Structure formats: C-alpha cells, structure tokens
User: Which sequence fits this backbone?
C-alpha cells in the first residue's frame, strides 16, 4: 500500500487513471473496500510492478527452487528417501485399500442414473482421488528409482 | 452412373439372398450367369460411397457348394468359373489404391487361404500374409473373428503356436451373433484347443463344457487323458472312432504332431524330480513304449524346451532337472522386461480412450 | 496355377528358351507375383548381362512384383531403362500408375535442385528418362483440350518452357477465355510458391502474351507491376501509350496506377516519365489531386451523421474526469471524417471547457481526421494555432501540428519542409513539458506527411530529438522515422535503432523503436530474419513486445510455415500478458489473404485461464474479417461480451464495429443486442471505464464517415495490401499503454462510389445503371439478381461485395470496357460520346480545380 | 483443379497445428502445477 | 492425373487426428480455467 496527496492541482496533466485498472467503483468494492472514492485522498491508484537487469533475473531462476541440495542431486536425498522407502511401501498400500472401496459403494447405491442425489459431479472427484494419488505414488517410485542406483562401476 | 448402377445392385443383392442357401436355381447356368453380372464395371473407378455393395459377405458359402459334387463332381481338375474367379479376385486387389480399402481387402484373401486348407499348398500363403496385413478399420465385428481365425490356422500348419496364440484370443471374444456363436464358435474353440494340443497343456473342461455341445467334448476328453497319461494305444483308438470328425475339420494331422506330444506331455506328468534316473525305471514307466526309446527320447525333448536333463551311459542313468531356482540377480530380471512388454499392449489404451 | 515350373527355367541356360518363357510368365505375374517375389534376386542379376537381349521382358515382370509390394519407386526405374514397356497411350490401372508415379517424383527432385540452379530444366541434372515423362504427359494433356491440367503440372515442375509453349499455341481468341486463363497462372504463383524469384518469371512472361494487344486486359497487368514494383514493367506500360495515342486509354490506365501503387512506386512513375516524355494531362493524375477531392465531395451529397446516437451518448454524464471527453472525441472524428463539420466545437461551449491539455489535444487534433482530404482550406482551420499565430495555450498549439499531418499525409511533401524547421528550432534545448508537446505534434505531423517517402533529413532531424531522451517528443521521433523508412529500408538504420534501445533504457522509446523496427521491414520475409533473431534472443519484454509486429509486416500476405511457428512459440514460453496478447494479434496480418483459418486458430485460445489470452484473439479475428464476410467470427466474439473483465468487453465490442459495417438489417441478427449495449453501458454508471469507453469507440466506427465509407484491407479496389491501412492497425493495437492512438485509423477509410466521368475531361455525371440487388443503401441503424431497374445507383452507401450483382447497361451514352470493372477507386468508365444529354451536374470540386 | 489445390493447403496449416497443441498441453501442466502449489 | 485424386483421399485421414487433439485439450484447459 501507499499514499499520495493531491488536494488542489495535479490536474491539467497526463492521464493518471488510464494506466492500470482504474476508473472503478462498481458497487463500493475496491482493494480493502474501506476506501471507495477518497481512499486516503483522491484515489492515487497505486501501480506496483517490478523490473530487473539480466544479471538479477539469472540468479533467482536457478538459485530459488525449493531448498538447496543443488549441483548434485544423486546422493543428497538418496539415503534419506531410501531409508523411508520401507515405510513408504506400507503407507501407499493403505491408500489403494480405500480406493476401490469408494467406487464399490458408488455404483452399488445407484440403480437410477438420474439426479435426485445432489451428486452433480459425483464420479470425477472420487475418480481423481483414485487416479491423481495413484499418479503421484507411482512416479515418485520410478523417476527417483532411476537415480536411486545409477552405480555402474 | 453411380446411382444407376447402385440402384440395379439393390435389386441384385435381394436376389443374392435367395442364391445363398435358399434358392440355387440351376447348378450350371447360374454360376455362368452370376459372373457376367459382376465383371462389367460394377466396382468401376472407386468414385464415391463404394463399399458393401459388391458380393463380399454373400459368396463365401456359395461357390464352395458348386465346386464339390455339383458342377465338377471330380470330373475335371478345377472349376473354370473358379479359375476366372481367381483372376477377378486377384485383379480386384491389384487395382486397389490402398486408400479406403479395409473390409474388402481381407474378405478376398479368405478365399485363397480357405482353398489352400482343403486342396492346395499353404507354403505360398505365407507370401500373401505380408500383403494381407493392414490396419483395417471397416471390418465388421462378425468378420473380425473370421479374419483372426484363418491367420491362426495357417500358423498351425507352419508349426508355430506362439504367433497364432494372439490371433485366436480375440477370435472367440468377437462375433456375438447366434449363428457365429454356435457353428462358428464351436469350430473355433476346437482350433483354440488345438493350440493347446501343440503346447502340451490341454486344460480340463470348465468353460468349454457348457459353451459347446457334446459333439466336440467327446474327442477332446479322450485326447486329454491319452496325451497326459502317455498312452499311444488309447490315442490310436481315438483317431479311428473319431476319424469322421477329424477329416471335415482338417484335424486329421494330429496323428503325427499330437502323437509326438503324447510323449512330451507325459514327461512332465511323471515325476523325474530325482537326479539319477536308472534306465530300467524309464522302461517300466510309460507302459512299454518308453522301453524302446530311452536315450533318443530324452535327447530331443531337452532341445525342444520341454525339460533339461543329462544322460550318462557309463553307469546307465540320466540326470534330470525340474527347473527350480531362487531369484538373486539375473533370475528375477528375466521377467522384468517381459512384464513391461506385457503392459505395452495396454499402453495403446491412451489413444483409444 | 503355380509359377514353379515357370521359375525353374529362370536359372537355366539357353536364353532362347527364356524368350518364350518370359512371355508366358508375364501373363501370370498379376496373380502369382507373391511367389515370384522370392525370385527377384535372380531376375535383376540377369538384367545386367550384355549377351542377354531379353532384359526388356524382365523389366516389366520385375516391375509388377513391386507394384503390389507397396513400393512404386522400384517399378519406375526398371521400366524406363528398357524404353519400350512404357507407353502413355495404353490406359490401364497398372500402366497409368507408373506414368502418374513420376509426377510428384519429378517435383520432389526438381525442388531440391532448384536451390542450386534455376536453369536445371535445360540440363541433364534431371534423369532424361524422367524428363521424357514430363514432356509426354503434357502432350496427352494438350490432346484432352484442357489447359488447367497441363499448366497445373508444369507449375509444380519448376519449368518455364512448358508454361509458355502450351499456353501460346492454344490462343484462338472469344477474347474472354484466355484472359481468364492467364489469371489462373498468376493467382496460383504468388499465393502458393513462397519464393519471389519463381513467381517473378510467371508475372513477367504473362505480360508478353498481351503485348500485341489482341483485345488485352490492362487491369491484370497493372496488378503485376504493383507486386514486383519493377521500374521496367512500369515504364513499359507508358511505352505502349507513347506509340498508340488514345485519350481514353492513356487516362484510364494512369487512374489505376496511382490508386494501386504505394507511395514509393508512385514517385518512381512521376520522375521517370519526364525523361521519356510526359503528357500534361497525366501530371495531375499521379499527383493525387482529384483523389483528395473525390473523398470530400462524395460525403457532401449523401450525408447522414445521425447525431441522435452521438448526442445521447455524450449526455449521459459529465464525469469520468477528462477521459469521458477524450472517449467521445475519438468517435467525434470518425463520424465527421471528411465531413468538415465543426458542430461539436461551435454549437457546444461547456463540454470543451472542462477538458485538460491532452483532452483538448485530442479534440483539436480530431479536426485533422474530420477535415482530412482538403488540400486547400484544411490549413485555414488550424490558422489561429499556427507557429506565429500564437494560440490559447502552448499545449493546444501542439495539437494543430498533428492534425495538419492527418490531412496531408502522403501529400505533405510541402508540409514536410514546413515542419522540418519547427523541429530543428526546438531541437537545441527543451526545459519544460509543453515545449515537448509542441515538438511532439510536429514529429508526428512530418512523419505522416512524409510517410512512404525515404528522406535522410527527417531521419537526421528526429535523431537529435531522440538523442535528448524525451518522454513526450522523443517517442514521436522513433515513430516518425519509421514512416519515412517504410519499404525495404536500409541496414544502417537497423543497427542504430536497435543499439540505442539497449543503451538508453526507456519504455516508450523502446516501444517507439520496437514499432519503428517493425515498420522499416516490409515484405522482406527471410531477409528480416537477422533482426528478428536479435529480438527473440533478448530477455527484455519491451523488445519482444514489438518483435511480433516485425514478423507480421515482413511476412504479411504470403505466409511462411516457420514464421507462423515463431509467433505461436512466443505466446507459450513467455509469461508476459502483454507479449502473449501482442503475439496473437500479429497473426492477423499474415492471414489477411486467407481468412478461413483465422477463426479456427483463435477458437482454441478463446477458452483459457488467463484473461489476456482472449484479448489479443478478439482483434486479430477482426483485423482481416472487418471488411470481409464469414459472420461466424461474430459467434467467437459473443462470449467475450459477458466476460467480467472490462478490457475484454472493450476488445469484443470494437471488433464487432469494424466487421459489421453495412452488415446490419437482418443479415447477421446480432445487431439487436450489439447496438443496444452501446447506449446501455454508457447509460448505466455501474459498469467499468474500459467497458464504457469501448462502447463509445465502437459506436463511432459504425457511423464513421457518415455510414458511407468503409475500412478496406485486401480488396479488389487496390488488389494488394494497403500500406496505410496496415500501419494504422499496428498503432491501433495500443490503448492504455501511452495515449490513445485511434486517430491513425483515418488512413484505412476509402470511399465507395461509381462515377463514369468521361473519356477526355472531368465530368462526374449523375446517372443510374438500373440493376436489381439487395438494398444496402437504405439499411442503417435507426434511433438475388432479377435484372430489374433500381431507384438510384449513384454513390450512396453501396458495397464492394454486393456491387458484383449490379451490371452496367449500354443503353446510355457510355460504352463499358471491362463490363463492370467493379473498383470504386479507379472507376472512370470509357465515354465514346462526350457532351451528350446525360444530365451533367457539376459538383463542388470544380471550384478549386 | 483449383478447388482441389486449395484443400491441400488447408491441411498443411493443420499440420503445424497438431504439433502446436502438444506444446500447450505440456506447457499448461507446468502452469497447472503452479496452481496446485498455490493451493 | 492420379496423384491429384490420390492426395485428395489421403488428406481426409488427417481430419480424425485433429478432432482427437481438440477434444483432449478442451477437457484439460477448461479445467484450469475453473481452478
């Protein structure tokens, strides 16, 4: 947030509002919606952007990802993920156990194929829970398994 | 002139229903009359909406009756109408541009393959297989099972049950029509069991018991116990009594191939588990047929992939192995690439869905 | 039945036995070839034997095996070497296959050798066995009495001998048949082949057929000169008029050359004419003096402003600061364009008083579009604000200079030197803001007046203003230089304008350079790829913003598969909303020729999670489809009107205005809710600013020019791409970026009129052709050929598309030449009997001429 | 023959469109992943 | 003469591949718009 005074003057100049999403006041809603017209004074209409040089943009792209394991990904998370792989194998089995039990009760209670059920989208939610979760658990056991050994000699 | 020819064919296809199994007219003039109403540019230049309007599905069971004890009656070498038919059949495929042709390409090959099944050589049919293979999208579900039926039968004469395995699986799952589930399915199930005859498994009767009548259950049940127990005497008596059923289905060749499988299957039935098997114990087992053939009998069965053994003539025994191991390094990795290959057939479902 | 007994003699001796054997084998190959395919190694081995003279028999037998194998290339090579079994006269499925197989093969082999040499068809580079096929195929096409099949094969064969030989000998001229057949060769040349050198030969060789004038057509030949812009073809047209003296033909040809050609080619015909001799009647023709008068006089006779919709739009509210007066001032200049109507300024005192500097800068400069077309009294309107007539304020004085360039644009060679001393006088130092505003209007005025003409002084004068790093007048310097640099341009200005962008960092200057670097490259196509690569490699979003327009203008017209792929690649990888919007807008300039694929590309982009993706797809669909058909493009803009985003509604409504011009009255029945939402959004104060201002701009475009003139881009009038129309749309693509650029749209308006004049002296008679068609003249927003007469065919609204249903009767004193040419710009039907009772009524342009 | 040559050009423009749809398909999943990380 | 008619019938097979990619994206990009 910012503030800038206007009072008398500041007119007979270039176009302040036309820049970014100004000329507003549908209902009272803008920003914090405690403002409407006056805001602090006159609706200075802040515009917040950012610009950086070629050196600054090159940094945060490669530097900032999640945390720093970088420069070698092989052995840093290898021992940590492999040690919990025995427990992960047992935890992913429970997720599959509750998968088909939802789809089994889904088609068992519907003999109609109409909507009295306020079920407007029933299947896609539970279908994605059995898909996206399955799609999440298998890819982390494959893509990581390729670099989990890579021993050669 | 496409509409004028199509309008005349609409009245011609109605007559062909009578010419098929219903009203055969004359056994001489009709086969000469049906030829002159086709050749004069009914297939034309392939202009538009040209398919299914030819004879196609209708003439499969027609010309086979005129050739056997009707026009010929073994008085000539081959039907002159069929000789011209083979000229028109192979000309239809020669002029084909391989554009919209899907169902019409696979139906004509069914004649040249079926002819080689009764009277003819099937060695030349292997060259047509390279031309026969196309992704046909217009073949109806009734003819998809027949297209897979002939491809599985040719490989049986070629002594390959592995290639014919994939074709016969999709053959019994298709053709829901009642006529195809009675006469065509029972004939196809006997060919599906014929693949198991060359494999050496020969499973028991579970699904096939109620799927077909007792006509096909009697010979398969007697051949099941004959090949499993390794008895050539009971296997010989089965061929004699059931010979009438073996000739019509072209299954009479089982007197050689399946007879050799009587010994190969009986090897896994009897227990060779112990290492050193004396020559006298082999002669006693498998009745007296295993007494005459001892060293040569085991020698070929090892290379064929049945078992793995070693023969010692010095002390007169044979060291045998039951193929039992424990997964350590390279043992479990053999099926690793196979299970991935098994899923490759299911990887095409992404484009289908 | 079996080929085994026939194939056994193939490996034996005594080739005389093989003579009768191969004759018996060749008949059964169509059947048993599957078995013969295993003997192919034995067949090809005996072919190379010199003592074996039957090789011609094995050539056809081996070819039929590969015929059904799926590879037709092997069967062609074996049949041609024997030079017997290949017969074009024999008609069969097998023989016609190997004859037609060499068609695309001759095209594929010639296209690869076309890059190294274009004369390859005169040498042995192509296989003579394959060359004879292309020669014998044309001989069969000539016997079929069809010139479309023969010329269609020779078009893809990259051979110039067959195209000229087969066409010239067939000329029996009916006189109407072979003038049309030439049109097929010229239409399929530039629109298909992307190479300019290949199509140049087709354009030049087609001119020699009409040289002797066997009742030729000069219209098609004029379009050829515009495409190549060659001085040889331009001077050749005047060479025929030098020996053959006709006042009707020499004047009518010059009327097309001045309208169709651009500003660069127009100046070439004027200078080069004096050396070979000139006609004093044609000196004023190429000067464009009557063209400016036909624009104003047309709108005076038939005039409907419809002020009821304009007065109601501006009477809703006096608020919205100065944006409300600026929004209505944009639509004010459109409706009164060419009308020279001051009723807005004179009759209303208050609305002008509440405006600010730049709001009055818009209203004062709006008179330039209003008075556009007047080459005499247009300056007297700006008289009080002149440099030395002082002004009411120095801010408004800068608006008189921009409006001065709007009227004289392209004719301002005298105004260019008038505005040159103003820029140099203020180029020394500027300490205030207003001194840049006065210099701003001078730079935009000299740029439009000199637009289309290369001037080194304007490029040098604006360089000093740009060097001062001015945020107001410096931006117009970069945009003003690009207008004089239009056309091929110079490589020196490419590196200087590009390096200055990365040296001094300014947004409006870079946008002025980015648009400037896009204007300096026109029709260069692959020649501009050097500058395009530098824009794509830079990470700056300002350079990549204008990089799409560089590809749009250079690749405009004939498109490139690689150039379109580059524009689609920028909108994907880059996350900038303004760049993704500017990338898809550039796709419209390349697709201007074929508008069928325009709605299909933007259809997938019409549904997206980003709001700015739908923004650029609205205008790019409306750029080409404005003056064209395909009302299905309106259905794409329908859901954009319900988008809560205000700028998307502004994007849809403005695009609906240009496409629906003269489309109203039950043709496309979307005008009920479209014309209602114009006054509905303005009346309701609950809407946003961008949605309300878009209804004002779209309302003025439908009424632009008094609902008479239309926006014409790639039509039959010019026949090619309009330079002033494309540049006006590029500037029109910026709304909230700096200040409203919609004033540049005045260059895209053209009058639609049918006037015969005479064959000697200017007349403008009033008559009627009396032809029945659908009535588009009396169809206007309110507050089938029966060969039947019509009320009045003179001027009114008409339409270029519906004109083709209006013929020209010969019962009058005028004799038609092309039988209803149909171009409203050139017009001037030939008059064989001047001074006849045609009821001539002189117009108002005769006073100043 | 003029209409037949025009139909050939129509499918040539769709050739680049088929490969371009796969470009947005893999690019949208990168933006869809960022939307899931925001949730 | 043949390849004029041959190309016409062969380019019709590419129409089915276009509808497969359009229906695949409509079921995807529309879901992202709702998110």
Assistant:
């Amino acid at each position: 947030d910012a503030f800038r005074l206007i009072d008398t003057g500041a007119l007979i100049n270039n176009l302040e509002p036309r820049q970014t999403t100004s000329n507003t006041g549908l209902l009272n809603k803008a920003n914090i919606q405690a403002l409407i017209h006056g805001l602090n004074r006159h609706y200075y209409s802040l515009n917040i952007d950012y610009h950086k040089t070629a050196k600054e943009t090159k940094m945060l792209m490669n530097l900032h990802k999640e945390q720093w394991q970088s420069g070698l990904k092989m052995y840093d998370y290898e021992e940590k993920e492999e040690s919990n792989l025995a427990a992960t194998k047992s935890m992913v089995k429970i997720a599959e156990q509750y998968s088909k039990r939802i789809e089994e009760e889904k088609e068992l209670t519907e003999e109609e194929l109409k909507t009295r059920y306020v079920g407007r989208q029933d299947p896609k939610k539970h279908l994605s829970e059995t898909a996206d979760e399955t799609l999440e658990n298998n890819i982390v056991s494959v893509l990581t398994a390729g670099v989990n050994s890579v021993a050669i000699k | 002139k496409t509409i004028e020819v199509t309008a005349e064919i609409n009245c011609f296809m109605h007559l062909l229903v009578q010419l098929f199994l219903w009203d055969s007219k004359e056994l001489e003039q009709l086969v000469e009359f049906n030829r002159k109403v086709v050749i004069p540019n009914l297939l034309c230049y392939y202009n538009l909406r040209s398919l299914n309007l030819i004879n196609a599905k209708l003439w499969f069971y027609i010309y086979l009756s005129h050739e056997t004890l009707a026009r010929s009656s073994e008085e000539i070498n081959s039907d002159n109408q069929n000789i011209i038919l083979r000229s028109t059949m192979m000309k239809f495929l020669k002029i084909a541009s391989l554009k919209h042709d899907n169902e019409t390409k696979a139906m004509l090959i069914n004649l040249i393959l079926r002819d080689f099944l009764n009277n003819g050589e099937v060695d030349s049919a292997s060259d047509f297989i390279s031309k026969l293979e196309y992704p046909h999208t217009d073949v109806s579900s009734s003819l998809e099972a027949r297209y897979f039926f002939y491809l599985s039968k040719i490989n049986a004469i070629q002594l390959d049950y592995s290639t014919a395995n994939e074709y016969i699986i999709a053959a019994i799952r298709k053709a829901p029509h009642n006529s195809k589930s009675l006469g065509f399915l029972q004939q196809s199930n006997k060919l599906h069991c014929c693949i198991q005859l060359l494999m050496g498994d020969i499973p028991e009767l579970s699904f096939f018991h109620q799927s077909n009548m007792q006509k096909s259950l009697l010979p398969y049940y007697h051949l099941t116990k004959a090949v499993k127990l390794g008895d050539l005497k009971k296997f010989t008596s089965t061929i004699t009594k059931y010979k009438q059923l073996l000739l019509k289905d072209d299954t009479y060749q089982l007197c050689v191939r399946l007879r050799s499988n009587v010994i190969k299957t009986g090897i896994r039935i009897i227990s060779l588990t112990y290492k050193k098997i004396s020559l006298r114990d082999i002669c006693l087992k498998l009745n007296l047929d295993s007494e005459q053939t001892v060293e040569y009998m085991v020698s070929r069965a090892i290379r064929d992939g049945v078992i793995e053994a070693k023969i010692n003539h010095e002390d007169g025994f044979i060291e045998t192995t039951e193929l039992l191991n424990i997964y350590d390094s390279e043992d479990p990795q053999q099926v690793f690439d196979e299970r991935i290959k098994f899923a490759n057939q299911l990887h095409d479902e992404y484009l289908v869905s | 039945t079996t080929a085994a007994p026939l194939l056994a003699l193939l490996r034996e001796n005594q080739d005389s036995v093989k003579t009768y054997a191969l004759e018996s084998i060749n008949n059964v190959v169509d059947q048993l070839w599957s078995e013969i395919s295993n003997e192919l190694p034995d067949i090809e081995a005996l072919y190379d034997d010199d003592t074996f003279s039957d090789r011609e028999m094995a050539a056809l037998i081996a070819s039929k095996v590969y015929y059904n194998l799926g590879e037709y290339e092997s069967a062609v090579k074996y049949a041609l070497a024997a030079k017997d079994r290949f017969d074009i006269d024999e008609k069969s499925q097998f023989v016609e296959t190997i004859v037609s197989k060499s068609i695309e093969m001759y095209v594929q082999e010639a296209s690869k050798q076309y890059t190294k040499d274009e004369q390859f068809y005169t040498k042995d580079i192509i296989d003579p066995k394959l060359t004879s096929i292309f020669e014998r195929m044309i001989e069969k096409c000539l016997k079929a009495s069809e010139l479309k099949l023969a010329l269609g094969i020779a078009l893809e064969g990259y051979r110039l001998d067959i195209i000229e030989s087969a066409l010239k000998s067939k000329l029996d001229q009916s006189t109407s048949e072979n003038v049309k057949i030439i049109n097929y060769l010229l239409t399929l040349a530039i629109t298909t082949v992307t190479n300019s050198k290949f199509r140049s030969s087709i354009l030049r060789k087609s001119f020699d057929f009409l040289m002797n004038m066997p009742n030729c057509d000069y219209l098609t030949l004029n379009k050829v000169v515009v495409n190549l812009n060659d001085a040889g073809l331009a001077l050749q047209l005047f060479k025929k008029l030098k020996e053959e003296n006709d006042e009707g033909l020499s004047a009518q040809i010059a009327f097309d050359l001045v309208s169709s050609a651009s500003q660069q080619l127009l100046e070439i015909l004027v200078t080069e004419l004096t050396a070979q001799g000139y006609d004093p009647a044609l000196l004023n023709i190429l000067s464009g003096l009557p063209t400016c008068d036909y624009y104003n006089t047309f709108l005076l006779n038939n005039k409907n402003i419809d002020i009821g919709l304009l007065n109601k739009s501006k009477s809703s509210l006096d608020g919205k600061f100065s944006l409300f007066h600026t929004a209505v001032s944009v639509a004010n200049g459109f409706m009164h364009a060419g009308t020279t109507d001051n009723s807005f300024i004179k009759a209303n005192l208050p609305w002008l008083g509440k405006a600010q500097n730049w709001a009055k800068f818009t209203a004062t400069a709006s008179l330039g579009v209003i008075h556009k077309g007047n080459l005499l009294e247009g300056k007297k309107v700006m008289a009080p604000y002149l440099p030395g007539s002082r002004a009411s304020s120095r801010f408004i004085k800068g608006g008189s200079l921009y409006g001065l360039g709007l009227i004289y644009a392209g004719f301002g060679r005298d105004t260019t030197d008038y505005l040159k001393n103003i820029i140099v006088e203020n180029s020394g130092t500027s300490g205030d803001e207003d001194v840049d505003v006065l210099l701003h209007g001078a730079s935009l005025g000299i740029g439009l007046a000199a637009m289309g003409s290369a001037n080194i002084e304007v490029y040098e004068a604006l360089k000093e203003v740009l060097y001062n790093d001015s945020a107001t007048s410096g931006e117009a310097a970069a945009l003003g230089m690009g207008l004089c640099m239009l056309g091929t341009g110079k490589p020196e200005a490419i590196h200087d304008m590009f390096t200055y962008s990365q040296e001094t960092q300014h947004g409006n200057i870079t946008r002025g350079l980015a648009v400037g670097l896009a204007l300096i490259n026109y029709g260069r196509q692959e020649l501009a790829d050097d500058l395009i690569t530098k824009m794509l490699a830079s990470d700056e979003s300002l350079l990549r913003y204008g990089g799409a327009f560089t590809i749009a203008l250079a690749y405009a017209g004939t498109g490139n598969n690689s150039a379109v792929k580059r524009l689609l690649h920028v909108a994907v990888s880059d996350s900038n909303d303004d760049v993704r919007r500017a990338a898809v807008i550039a796709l419209g300039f390349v697709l201007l020729r074929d508008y069928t694929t325009v709605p299909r590309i933007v259809q997938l982009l019409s549904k997206s999670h980003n709001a700015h993706v739908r923004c650029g797809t609205a205008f790019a669909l409306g750029i080409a489809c404005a003056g064209k058909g395909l009302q299905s493009a309106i259905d794409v803009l329908d859901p954009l009107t319900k988008d809560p985003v205000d700028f998307v509604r502004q994007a849809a409504m403005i695009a609906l205005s240009m496409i629906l011009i003269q489309q109203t009255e039950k043709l496309n029945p979307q005008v009920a809710d479209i014309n209602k939402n114009f006054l509905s959004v303005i009346t309701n104060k609950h809407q946003e600013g961008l949605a309300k201002f878009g209804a004002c701009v779209a309302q003025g475009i439908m009424n632009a020019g008094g609902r008479n003139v239309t926006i014409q881009l790639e039509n039959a009038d010019t026949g090619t791409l309009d330079t002033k129309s494309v540049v006006g749309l590029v500037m029109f693509s910026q709304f909230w970026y700096w200040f409203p650029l919609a004033h540049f749209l005045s260059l895209s308006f053209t009058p639609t009129t049918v006037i015969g004049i005479r064959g000697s002296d200017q007349a403008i008679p009033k008559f009627q052709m009396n032809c029945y068609a659908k009535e588009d003249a009396f169809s206007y927003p309110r507050m089938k050929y029966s060969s039947k007469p019509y009320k009045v065919d003179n001027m009114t609204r008409i339409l270029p598309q519906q004109s083709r249903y209006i013929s020209f009767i010969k019962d009058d004193r005028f004799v038609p030449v092309r039988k209803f040419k149909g171009n409203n710009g050139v017009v001037v039907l030939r008059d064989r009997e001047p001074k006849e009772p045609v009821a001539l009524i002189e117009t108002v342009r005769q006073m100043k001429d | 023959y003029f209409k037949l040559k025009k139909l050939e050009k129509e499918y040539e423009l769709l050739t680049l469109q088929e490969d371009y749809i796969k470009d947005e398909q893999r690019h949208l999943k990168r933006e869809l992943k960022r939307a899931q990380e925001e949730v | 003469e043949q390849k004029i008619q041959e190309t016409e019938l062969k380019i019709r097979s590419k129409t089915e591949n276009v509808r497969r990619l359009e229906a695949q994206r409509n079921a995807l990009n529309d879901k992202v718009r709702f998110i």
